[PDB]
mmCIF file of C-alpha atoms and ligand atoms in Angstrom:
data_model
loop_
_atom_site.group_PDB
_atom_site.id
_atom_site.type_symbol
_atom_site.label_atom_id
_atom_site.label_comp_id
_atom_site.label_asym_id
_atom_site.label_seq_id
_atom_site.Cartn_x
_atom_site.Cartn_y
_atom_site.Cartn_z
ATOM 1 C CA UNK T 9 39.896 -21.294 22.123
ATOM 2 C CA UNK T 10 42.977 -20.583 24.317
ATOM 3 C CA UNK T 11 42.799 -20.745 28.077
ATOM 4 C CA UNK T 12 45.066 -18.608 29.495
ATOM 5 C CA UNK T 13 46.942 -20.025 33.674
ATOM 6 C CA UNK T 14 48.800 -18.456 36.405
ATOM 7 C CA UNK T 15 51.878 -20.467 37.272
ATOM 8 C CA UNK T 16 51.879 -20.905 40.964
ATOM 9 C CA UNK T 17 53.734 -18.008 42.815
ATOM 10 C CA UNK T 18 56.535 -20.737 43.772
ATOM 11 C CA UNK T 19 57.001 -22.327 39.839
ATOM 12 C CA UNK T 20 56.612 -18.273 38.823
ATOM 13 C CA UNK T 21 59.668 -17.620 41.328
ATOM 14 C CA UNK T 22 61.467 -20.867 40.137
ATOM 15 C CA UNK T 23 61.220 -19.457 36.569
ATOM 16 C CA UNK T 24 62.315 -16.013 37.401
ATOM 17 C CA UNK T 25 65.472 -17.330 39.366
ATOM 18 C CA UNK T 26 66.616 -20.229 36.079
ATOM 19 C CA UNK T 27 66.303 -16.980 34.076
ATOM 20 C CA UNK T 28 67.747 -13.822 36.431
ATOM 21 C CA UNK T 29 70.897 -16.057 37.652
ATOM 22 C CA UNK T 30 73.672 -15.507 36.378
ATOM 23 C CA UNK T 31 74.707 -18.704 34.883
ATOM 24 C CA UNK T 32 77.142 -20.057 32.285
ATOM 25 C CA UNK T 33 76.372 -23.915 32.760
ATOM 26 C CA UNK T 34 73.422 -23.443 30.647
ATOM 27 C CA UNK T 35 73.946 -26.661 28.326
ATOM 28 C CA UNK T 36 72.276 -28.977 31.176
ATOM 29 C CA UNK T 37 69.177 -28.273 29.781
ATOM 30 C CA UNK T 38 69.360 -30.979 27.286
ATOM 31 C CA UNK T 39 70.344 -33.591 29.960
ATOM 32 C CA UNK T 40 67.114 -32.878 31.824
ATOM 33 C CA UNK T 41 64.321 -32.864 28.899
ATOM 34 C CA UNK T 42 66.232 -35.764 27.499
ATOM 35 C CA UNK T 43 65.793 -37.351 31.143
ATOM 36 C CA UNK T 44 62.182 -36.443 31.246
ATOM 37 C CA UNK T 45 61.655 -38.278 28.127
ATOM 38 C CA UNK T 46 63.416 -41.301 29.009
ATOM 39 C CA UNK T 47 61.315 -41.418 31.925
ATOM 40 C CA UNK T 48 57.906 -40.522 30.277
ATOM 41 C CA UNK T 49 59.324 -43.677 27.485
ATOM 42 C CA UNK T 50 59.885 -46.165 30.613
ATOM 43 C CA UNK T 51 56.206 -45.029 31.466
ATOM 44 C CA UNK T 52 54.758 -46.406 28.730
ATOM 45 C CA UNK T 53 56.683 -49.298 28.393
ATOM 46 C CA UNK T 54 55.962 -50.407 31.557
ATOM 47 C CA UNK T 55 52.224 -50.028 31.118
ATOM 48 C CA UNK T 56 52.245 -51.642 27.811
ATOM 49 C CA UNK T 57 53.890 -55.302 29.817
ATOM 50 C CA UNK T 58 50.392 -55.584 31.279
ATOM 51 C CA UNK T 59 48.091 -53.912 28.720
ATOM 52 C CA UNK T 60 49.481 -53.909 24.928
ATOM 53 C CA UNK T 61 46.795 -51.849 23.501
ATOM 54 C CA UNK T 62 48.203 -49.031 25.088
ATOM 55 C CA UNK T 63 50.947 -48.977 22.447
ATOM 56 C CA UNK T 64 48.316 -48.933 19.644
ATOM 57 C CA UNK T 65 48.886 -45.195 19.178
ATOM 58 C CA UNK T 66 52.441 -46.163 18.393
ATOM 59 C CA UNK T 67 55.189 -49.014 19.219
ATOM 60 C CA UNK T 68 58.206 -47.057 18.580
ATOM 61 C CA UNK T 69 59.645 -46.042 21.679
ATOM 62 C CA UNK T 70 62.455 -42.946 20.811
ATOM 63 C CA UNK T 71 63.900 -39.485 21.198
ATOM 64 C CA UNK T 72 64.500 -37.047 18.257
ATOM 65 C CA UNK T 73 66.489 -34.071 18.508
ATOM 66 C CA UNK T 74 65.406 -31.518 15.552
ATOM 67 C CA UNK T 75 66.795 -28.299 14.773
ATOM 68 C CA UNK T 76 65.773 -25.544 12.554
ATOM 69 C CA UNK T 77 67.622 -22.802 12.285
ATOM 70 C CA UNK T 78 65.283 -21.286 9.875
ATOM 71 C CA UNK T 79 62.599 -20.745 13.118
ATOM 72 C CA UNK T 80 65.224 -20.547 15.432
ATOM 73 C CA UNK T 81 63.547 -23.663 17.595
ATOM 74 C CA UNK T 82 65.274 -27.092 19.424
ATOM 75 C CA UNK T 83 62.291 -29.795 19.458
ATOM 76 C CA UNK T 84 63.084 -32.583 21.727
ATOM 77 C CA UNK T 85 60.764 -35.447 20.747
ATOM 78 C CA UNK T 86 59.361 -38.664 22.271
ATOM 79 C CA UNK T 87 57.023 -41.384 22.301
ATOM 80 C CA UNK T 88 57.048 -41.811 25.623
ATOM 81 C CA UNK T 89 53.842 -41.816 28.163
ATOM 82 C CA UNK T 90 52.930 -38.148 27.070
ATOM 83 C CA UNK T 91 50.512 -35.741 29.234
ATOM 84 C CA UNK T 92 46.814 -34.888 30.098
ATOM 85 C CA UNK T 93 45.476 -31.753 30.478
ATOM 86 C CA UNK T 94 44.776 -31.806 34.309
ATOM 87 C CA UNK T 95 48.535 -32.716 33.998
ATOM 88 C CA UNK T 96 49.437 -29.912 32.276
ATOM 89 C CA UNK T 97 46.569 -27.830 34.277
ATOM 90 C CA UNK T 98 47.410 -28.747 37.495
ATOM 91 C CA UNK T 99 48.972 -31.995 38.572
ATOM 92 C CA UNK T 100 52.411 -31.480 37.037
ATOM 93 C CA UNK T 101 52.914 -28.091 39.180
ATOM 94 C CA UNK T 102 51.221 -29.868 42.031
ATOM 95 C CA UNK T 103 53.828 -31.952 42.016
ATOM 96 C CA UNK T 104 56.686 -29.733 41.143
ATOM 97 C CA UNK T 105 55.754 -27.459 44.209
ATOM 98 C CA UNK T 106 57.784 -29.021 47.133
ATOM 99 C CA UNK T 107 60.582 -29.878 44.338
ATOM 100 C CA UNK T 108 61.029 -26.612 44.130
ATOM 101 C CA UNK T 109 61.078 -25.868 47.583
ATOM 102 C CA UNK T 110 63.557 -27.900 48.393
ATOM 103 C CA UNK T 111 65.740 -27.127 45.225
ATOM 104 C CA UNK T 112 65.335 -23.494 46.358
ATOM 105 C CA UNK T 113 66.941 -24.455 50.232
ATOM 106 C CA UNK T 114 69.824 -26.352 48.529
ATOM 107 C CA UNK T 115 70.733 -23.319 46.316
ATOM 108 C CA UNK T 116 70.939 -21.013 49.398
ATOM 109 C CA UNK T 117 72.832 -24.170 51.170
ATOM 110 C CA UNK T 118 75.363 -24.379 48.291
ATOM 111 C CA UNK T 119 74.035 -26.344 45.472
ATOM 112 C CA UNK T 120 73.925 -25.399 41.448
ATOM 113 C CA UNK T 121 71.467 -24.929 38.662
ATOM 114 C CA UNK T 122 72.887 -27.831 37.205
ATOM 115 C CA UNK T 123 71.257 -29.595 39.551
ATOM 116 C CA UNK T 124 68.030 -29.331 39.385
ATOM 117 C CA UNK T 125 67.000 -32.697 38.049
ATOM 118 C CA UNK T 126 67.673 -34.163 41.503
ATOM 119 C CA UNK T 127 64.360 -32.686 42.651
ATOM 120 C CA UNK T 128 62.047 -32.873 40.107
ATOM 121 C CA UNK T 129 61.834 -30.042 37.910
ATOM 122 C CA UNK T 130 64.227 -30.120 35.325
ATOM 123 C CA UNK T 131 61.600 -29.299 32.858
ATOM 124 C CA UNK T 132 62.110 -25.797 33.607
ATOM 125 C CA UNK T 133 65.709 -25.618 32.822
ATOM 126 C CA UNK T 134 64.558 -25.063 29.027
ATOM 127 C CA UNK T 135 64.032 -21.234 30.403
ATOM 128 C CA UNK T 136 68.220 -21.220 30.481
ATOM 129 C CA UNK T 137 67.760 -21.010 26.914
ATOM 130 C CA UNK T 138 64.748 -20.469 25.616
ATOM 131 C CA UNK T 139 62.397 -17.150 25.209
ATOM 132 C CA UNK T 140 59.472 -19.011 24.675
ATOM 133 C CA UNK T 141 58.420 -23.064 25.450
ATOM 134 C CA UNK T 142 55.758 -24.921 23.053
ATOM 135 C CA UNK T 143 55.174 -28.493 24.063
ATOM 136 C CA UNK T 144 52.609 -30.808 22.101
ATOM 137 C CA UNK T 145 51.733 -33.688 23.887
ATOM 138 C CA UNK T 146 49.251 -36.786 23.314
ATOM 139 C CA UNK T 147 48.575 -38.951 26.418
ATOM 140 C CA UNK T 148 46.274 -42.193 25.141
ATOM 141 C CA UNK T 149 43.447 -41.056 27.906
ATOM 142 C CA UNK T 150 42.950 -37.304 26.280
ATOM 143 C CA UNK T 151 43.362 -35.311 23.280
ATOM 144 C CA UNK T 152 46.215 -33.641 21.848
ATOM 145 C CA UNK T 153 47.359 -30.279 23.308
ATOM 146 C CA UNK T 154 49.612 -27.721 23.229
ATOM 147 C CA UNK T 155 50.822 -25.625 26.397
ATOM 148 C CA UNK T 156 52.884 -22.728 25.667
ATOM 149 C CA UNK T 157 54.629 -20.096 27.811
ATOM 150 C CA UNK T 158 57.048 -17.108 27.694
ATOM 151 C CA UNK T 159 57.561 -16.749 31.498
ATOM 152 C CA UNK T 160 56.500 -13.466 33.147
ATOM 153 C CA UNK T 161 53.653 -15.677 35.716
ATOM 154 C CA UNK T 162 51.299 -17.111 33.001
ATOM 155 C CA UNK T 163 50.954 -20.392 30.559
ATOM 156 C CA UNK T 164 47.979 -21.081 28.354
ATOM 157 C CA UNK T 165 46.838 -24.544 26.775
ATOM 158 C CA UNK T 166 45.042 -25.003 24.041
ATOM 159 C CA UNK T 167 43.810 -27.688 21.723
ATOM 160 C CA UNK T 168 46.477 -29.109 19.344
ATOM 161 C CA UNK T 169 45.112 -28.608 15.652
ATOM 162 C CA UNK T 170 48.117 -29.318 13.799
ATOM 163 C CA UNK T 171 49.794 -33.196 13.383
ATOM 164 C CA UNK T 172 48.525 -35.676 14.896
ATOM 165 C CA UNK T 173 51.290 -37.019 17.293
ATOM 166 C CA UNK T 174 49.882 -40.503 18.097
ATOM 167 C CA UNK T 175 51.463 -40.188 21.459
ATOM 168 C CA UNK T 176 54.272 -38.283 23.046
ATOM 169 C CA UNK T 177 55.338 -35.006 24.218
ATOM 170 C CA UNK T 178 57.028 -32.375 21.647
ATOM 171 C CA UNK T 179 59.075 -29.943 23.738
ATOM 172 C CA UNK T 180 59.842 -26.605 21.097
ATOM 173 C CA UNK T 181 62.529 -24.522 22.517
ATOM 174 C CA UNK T 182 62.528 -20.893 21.156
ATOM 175 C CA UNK T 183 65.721 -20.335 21.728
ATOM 176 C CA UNK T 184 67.469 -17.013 22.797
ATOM 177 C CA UNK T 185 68.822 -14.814 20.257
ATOM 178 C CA UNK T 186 72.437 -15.752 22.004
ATOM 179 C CA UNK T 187 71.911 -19.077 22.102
ATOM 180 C CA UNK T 188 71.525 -20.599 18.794
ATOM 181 C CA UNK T 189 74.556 -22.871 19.250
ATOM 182 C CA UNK T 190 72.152 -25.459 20.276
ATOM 183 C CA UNK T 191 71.279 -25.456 17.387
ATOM 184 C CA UNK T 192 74.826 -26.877 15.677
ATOM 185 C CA UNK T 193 74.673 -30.613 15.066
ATOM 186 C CA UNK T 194 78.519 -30.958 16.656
ATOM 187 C CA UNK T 195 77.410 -28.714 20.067
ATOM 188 C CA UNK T 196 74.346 -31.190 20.213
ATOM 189 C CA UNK T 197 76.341 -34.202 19.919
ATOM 190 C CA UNK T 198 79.036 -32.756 22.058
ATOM 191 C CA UNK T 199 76.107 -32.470 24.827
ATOM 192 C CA UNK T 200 74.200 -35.961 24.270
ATOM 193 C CA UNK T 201 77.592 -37.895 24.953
ATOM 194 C CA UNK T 202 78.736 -35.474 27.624
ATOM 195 C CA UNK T 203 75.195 -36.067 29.838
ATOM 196 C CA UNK T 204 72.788 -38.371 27.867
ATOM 197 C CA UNK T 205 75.667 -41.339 27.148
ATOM 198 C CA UNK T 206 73.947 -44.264 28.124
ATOM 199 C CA UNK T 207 70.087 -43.117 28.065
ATOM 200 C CA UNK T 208 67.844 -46.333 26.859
ATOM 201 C CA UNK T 209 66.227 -45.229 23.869
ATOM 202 C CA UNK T 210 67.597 -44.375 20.746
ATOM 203 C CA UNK T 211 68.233 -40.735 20.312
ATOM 204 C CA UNK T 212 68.431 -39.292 16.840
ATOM 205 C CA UNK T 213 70.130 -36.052 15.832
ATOM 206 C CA UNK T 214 68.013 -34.735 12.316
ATOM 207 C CA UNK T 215 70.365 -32.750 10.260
ATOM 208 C CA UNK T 216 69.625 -29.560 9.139
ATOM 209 C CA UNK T 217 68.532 -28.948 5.036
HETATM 210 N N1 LIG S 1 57.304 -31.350 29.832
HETATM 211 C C1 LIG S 1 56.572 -30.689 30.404
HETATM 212 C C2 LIG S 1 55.651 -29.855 31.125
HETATM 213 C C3 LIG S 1 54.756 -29.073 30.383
HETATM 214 C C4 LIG S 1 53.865 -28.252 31.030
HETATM 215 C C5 LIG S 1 53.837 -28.187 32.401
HETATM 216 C C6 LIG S 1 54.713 -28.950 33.156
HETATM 217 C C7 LIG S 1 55.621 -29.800 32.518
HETATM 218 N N2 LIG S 1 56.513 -30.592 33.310
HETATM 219 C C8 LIG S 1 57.076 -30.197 34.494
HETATM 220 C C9 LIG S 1 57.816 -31.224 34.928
HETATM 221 N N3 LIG S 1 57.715 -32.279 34.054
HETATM 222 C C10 LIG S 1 56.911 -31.869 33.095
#
């Protein structure tokens, strides 16, 4: 059962300017999914200070990086906080509405793709790379999920059948056919000390079989 969304007209138009501009910065994506998990991880943690059960669908509090060149995909991993639906449905875009409003004014005033985490929607950066966006995510109040879109105005969410995540958010970059270098373990590690140095949560790199 897949329930198919339109993407605000404002997120639609943010999506259609990250991929129509030209570009060549495009590496910052990592920084700001890698960001987003950090924060979703401090989320959690925070919560947990005053309520440990919340950490009884998992105590490990991480980022993996894992690439497969075989599907072409970047998953960027966590254990943080994860998502609900109405969060995916609606609250998350809610949100990223007047981000995007003002990240559209500083373009025009002279700012940069690059950035875009200074106003709250980074997550869509993964378009400056990737054809399609997967993300599996497990909050502790709701079930598992996975939201999916290729652009073009629409998402659709679904129930997650696959692994159970315990709790998290799975980002799954289908990366470009131009852009599998983010997919070489020295271009990743090249990026994670460039932007991600001193992020609180261990980040592992998987290798490749
Ligand atoms: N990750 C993520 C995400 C997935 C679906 C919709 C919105 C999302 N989002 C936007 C900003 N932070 C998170």
């Amino acid at each position: 059962e897949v329930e198919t969304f339109a993407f605000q007209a404002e997120i639609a138009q943010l999506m259609s300017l990250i991929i129509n501009t030209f570009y060549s910065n495009k590496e910052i994506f990592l920084r700001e999914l890698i960001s987003n998990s950090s924060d979703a991880l401090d989320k959690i943690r925070y919560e947990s200070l005053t309520d440990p059960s919340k950490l009884d669908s998992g105590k490990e509090l991480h980022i993996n990086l894992i690439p497969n060149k075989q599907d072409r995909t970047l998953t960027i991993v966590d254990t943080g906080i994860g998502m609900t639906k109405a969060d995916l449905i609606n609250n998350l875009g809610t949100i990223a509405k007047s981000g995007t409003k003002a990240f559209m004014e500083a373009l025009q005033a002279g700012a940069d793709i690059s950035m875009i985490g200074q106003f709250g929607v980074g997550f869509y950066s993964a378009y400056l790379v990737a054809e399609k966006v997967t993300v599996i995510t497990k909050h502790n109040d709701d079930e598992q999920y996975a939201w999916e879109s290729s652009a073009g105005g629409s998402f659709t969410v679904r129930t997650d059948t696959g692994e159970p995540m315990g709790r998290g958010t799975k980002v799954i970059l289908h990366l470009k056919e131009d852009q599998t270098e983010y997919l070489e373990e020295r271009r990743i590690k090249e990026i994670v000390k460039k932007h991600s140095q001193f992020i609180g949560y261990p980040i592992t790199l998987f290798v490749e079989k």
